[PDB]
């Protein structure tokens, strides 16, 4: 039949546990296997990978497995598996990472659908409160027409089509050590005019943390990858984006704390890098597309004033925007919290900006102040640009959301003299079903984030509180706890994965009733928000009070949610029980620790 | 004609903390003819003893006794008491030391004003302050004010021996009781004891190092005992309410806050039930109105039996606290400035609130709990000028805390939202470090900077933070003072190049370096510092020609200077006849620079 897709991996000495979990990721596709391949090929394994291989693809027809040599210098896996592929569209799948269970099938047909050449699904990362923020916001059938910026983040983790790789000859550049070879290869594919489509409302790729540092390697690929800009894109507007994102974010990304962090013989090789860069490929219009402390970054730079960049870097440590929780509260069926933030440092003393006539300037020491042009240190034209959102991170599947439906308003206030802070607040619901996408979601901690921007500043920090703060609530069959973690930061229980709701709620154990005849062991809920109808099955475990080894007894329970109230029924069935015993619950894998005894 | 009497109970002293403790004794600017040592060991099973023959084989006025084993150290301290000679009695632990000039400011103090008892004052290893009201001025009248003045009521106090043995005031030598020393100080107060409070220096160094009182019935066995010894023995009737408003605040009333969410259920309900009894039988009920908000909330409680309130009010208060953050730090003529400010939070983070109910702030309560209470007890209106906000300053070799004097705060009741109210304050100080340099090792050591911050029953003592980087220097009288954000992201000050060298913090005028045709004088000037007054300090640099990899250095004395409100390294040369270019390593109190100076010569 018609191969689907391609899955293309290449291996050497591959960790055989990521590669089991990797197989399992394919396994678990809804698509029917015989609709995709896996095209596997070991470049020299030193270990067994190679006969692990041939194993897995015993079982597996749809599955090849090709050893080459060590690649002979000048050549790649990714190519020789690319032109032995047969399916429509062709995914480079990572030998450690994994792809969740509806990839394939929603990736497909949203390519065919829409007959597009790049499907840029929606990535996650182990770490991070973020990824591809921007772009994977919205699902985006004609998102070539952004420009190049489209494909980022320009990881090689897309879904290209293989009649359109062929047909302008785009592989990956056979250097042996080329860093960024999927931002050639990405580029490529958009200088050829393809019809680019971003899935946003499923996570396609996990992206696991495994796990350059010489500056002259470091800087001889940062040229070859500008010299690769300039040569090749001939869009305007694409060039112009990606000389503007690739110069402020590696070439003047080390002009801030990355001077703090760094011996001076080492920032010397790296600064007259930068500069000897800036000046010869980098052009003076870029400056215009920076914001406000980009452009003092990029003018010293090219002043070679390293000094003056050195104090900015202290100047500017700690500048931070954290959130705290002012209220937090089950409602219905949604969870609500209401946030505050104001720009600090470190959490600590406000970070101010000052007034001086009608201009909003930034605190520098006049200094420094002379040395740089007048506007660049003007925020008057940026203090109504400032966003406040909230996310949610799943802590199994890594995928990062943004909560929608969020409420902000960020003000800057005059604090006192002329010096005036930045502070926000934030009101905003969490309906835990707009993020529950696999069945495996629905059992699963939930970590609280917030995104701060403004002035130049990017903060995306855990939200945090300081009181102790556990809620429970019951709603349609989901047991929620939102609470204060260990770390001060803000999390969110769904299904008993971490915490016990009948612990965490409480028990009115002057109200527990036995009922005897019926066999029948009510234990009501203290402190829970109930919604709607809920019926969880469980287990309960009985003990002889006194006797030390004793046999737990084990019982049926379940936990009910009616009428706005929660309650554990234990039920005895036929046991034959006389005397005061132990009760402790199991629902969803978790004990109470109420100590509750009954007589019976 | 003996001035001071020193006894030293020993049993099992470690062989450094036993040595640290003869030193302190040496060092004492009384004449050594004027004092006597009085070591009792309590029959060692070591060779604690051994070492004891072993000092008072050299000194002349220390005397060593081994008694049979009792114990605890009452034996051996009523029996070193009677075999003293001097007219003060000071009580030495094996594991402490005393400052040097302690005898003699003592001495001079209890004698000018005839005195039977000298609370000096005490310092601690750890904490932000020891005796913070009691130990804040000088008090050669203390008595007046009741028995107050002994507190805290440690034992490294100095009585006068005539009045201990004329009085019959011993240490029980019975079984081992907890607060032994509130025994004894409390049997000498009540005996009208003229009591003066010497605060002006540190006396004693009660350092922790490193015993039975864990098992919860022989706890409060012990609190049964000393609550009675109160009733029985004050006579006065404005000592006994203190004393028990004092203790039932303490260590009664003090296991009914945090104290429920550090322990399980089982020791909770033999403790509490233990304060109950203790409550109802020995603590009358006006003892209570002499208490605040929240202390009136948990007697109340504690009487009803409800330590399931209680467990949960617990939880509502935990995290309250007050931390500083520096809004401005700079050098001003001879002293350091601060401007702090701080407010009432959870753990340094959302604010904390009371609300406003009709005309009445209230304590932030639920319903279930708010009904249980009179509403008196949950009502701070009264309090709400109350608020303290202080600074204080702590050497870190001799871990003594000092007050900050002449201080300004403000503290303000500021509605956030709604009816919700929270607590701001501001707070400007300055610090003169020659107020609490007083012995010569105070001259070179880092100081930490903290807040204190009381309030609706809150007390919050912490050091002063700040997020952004802080580094400022200053030469100030031969002073060389730096103060920054430490590596814990604390306030601290170094004075003398204890920890940071005041030549690479400032900054080196690069393009501004001397060198004389003739004389041959380097100069250096110093390009960020606050400099008052005349300075100069003498130190050395270090010089190695370019190129020459591991060439002998070339030692030379430089000194800094401060002058006109400049500061400035000269090198003096002289007789080293060099040429070519050499690197320059200044080396002002022990602390080299990292400035890279090269100079050509
Ligand atoms: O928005 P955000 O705040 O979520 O930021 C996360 C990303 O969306 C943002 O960093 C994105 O703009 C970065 O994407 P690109 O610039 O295309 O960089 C491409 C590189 O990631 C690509 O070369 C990687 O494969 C290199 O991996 P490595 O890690 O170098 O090792
Ligand atoms: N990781 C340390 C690197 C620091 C480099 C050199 C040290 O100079 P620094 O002043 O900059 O650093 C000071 C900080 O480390 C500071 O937090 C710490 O060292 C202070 O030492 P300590 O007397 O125990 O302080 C104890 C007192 O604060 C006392 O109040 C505590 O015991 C209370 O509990
Ligand atoms: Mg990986
Ligand atoms: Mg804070």
Request: charged fraction near 30%; aromatic fraction near 10%.
């Amino acid at each position: 039949k018609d191969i689907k897709i391609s899955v293309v991996v290449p291996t050497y000495n591959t960790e055989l546990e990521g590669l089991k979990n990797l197989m399992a990721s394919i396994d678990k596709q809804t698509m029917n296997p015989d609709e995709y391949e896996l095209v596997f090929v070991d470049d020299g394994s030193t270990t067994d990978t190679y006969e692990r291989l041939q194993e897995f693809a015993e079982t597996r027809p749809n599955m090849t497995v090709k050893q080459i040599e060590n690649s002979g210098w000048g050549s790649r896996p990714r190519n020789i598996a690319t032109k032995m592929a047969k399916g429509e569209y062709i995914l480079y799948l990572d030998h450690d990472d994994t792809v969740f269970p509806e990839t394939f099938e929603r990736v497909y047909n949203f390519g065919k659908e829409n007959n597009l050449d790049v499907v840029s699904g929606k990535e996650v990362r182990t770490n991070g409160w973020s990824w591809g923020w921007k772009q994977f916001s919205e699902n985006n059938p004609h998102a070539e027409e952004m420009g190049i910026e489209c494909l980022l983040p320009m990881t090689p983790h897309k879904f290209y089509k293989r009649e359109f790789l062929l047909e302008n000859d785009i592989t990956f550049d056979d250097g042996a050590r080329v860093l960024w070879e999927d931002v050639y290869f990405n580029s490529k594919a958009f200088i050829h005019g393809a019809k680019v489509g971003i899935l946003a409302d499923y996570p396609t790729y996990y992206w696991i943390a495994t796990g350059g540092r010489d500056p002259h390697e470091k800087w001889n690929q940062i040229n070859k990858l500008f010299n690769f800009f300039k040569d090749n894109i001939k869009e305007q507007r694409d060039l112009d984006f990606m000389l503007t994102h690739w110069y402020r974010s590696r070439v003047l990304g080390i002009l801030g704390q990355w001077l703090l962090k760094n011996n001076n013989e080492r920032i010397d090789i790296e600064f007259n890098y930068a500069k000897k860069l800036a000046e010869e490929l980098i052009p003076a219009y870029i400056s215009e597309n920076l914001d406000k402390n980009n452009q003092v970054k990029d003018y010293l730079l090219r002043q070679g004033d390293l000094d003056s960049l050195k104090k900015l870097a202290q100047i500017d440590a700690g500048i931070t925007a954290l959130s705290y929780v002012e209220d937090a509260y089950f409602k219905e069926d949604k969870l609500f919290f209401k946030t505050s933030t104001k720009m600090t440092y470190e959490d600590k003393e406000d970070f101010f900006i000052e007034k001086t006539a009608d201009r909003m300037e930034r605190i520098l020491p006049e200094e420094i102040k002379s040395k740089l042009p007048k506007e660049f240190f003007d925020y008057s034209d940026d203090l109504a640009e400032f966003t406040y959102e909230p996310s949610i991170k799943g802590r199994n599947s890594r995928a990062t959301w943004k909560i929608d439906g969020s409420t902000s308003n960020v003000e800057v206030v005059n604090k006192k003299a002329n010096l005036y802070k930045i502070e926000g607040e934030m009101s905003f619901s969490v309906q835990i079903n707009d993020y529950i996408l696999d069945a495996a979601d629905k059992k699963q901690p939930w970590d609280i984030a917030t995104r701060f921007t403004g002035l130049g500043y990017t903060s995306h920090r855990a939200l945090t509180i300081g009181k102790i703060l556990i809620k429970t609530a019951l709603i349609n069959n989901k047991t929620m706890i939102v609470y204060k973690n260990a770390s001060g930061l803000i999390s969110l229980d769904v299904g008993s994965s971490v915490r016990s709701i009948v612990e965490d709620s409480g028990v009115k154990r002057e109200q527990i009733l036995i009922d005897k005849t019926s066999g029948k062991v009510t234990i009501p809920l203290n402190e829970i928000h109930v919604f709607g109808e809920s019926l969880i099955e469980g287990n309960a475990e009985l003990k002889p009070v006194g006797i030390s080894d004793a046999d737990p007894i084990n019982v049926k329970a379940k936990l009910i949610g009616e009428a706005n109230k929660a309650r554990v029924e234990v039920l005895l069935g036929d046991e034959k029980l006389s005397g005061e015993y132990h009760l402790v619950t199991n629902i969803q894998g978790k004990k109470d620790k109420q100590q509750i005894k009954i007589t019976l």
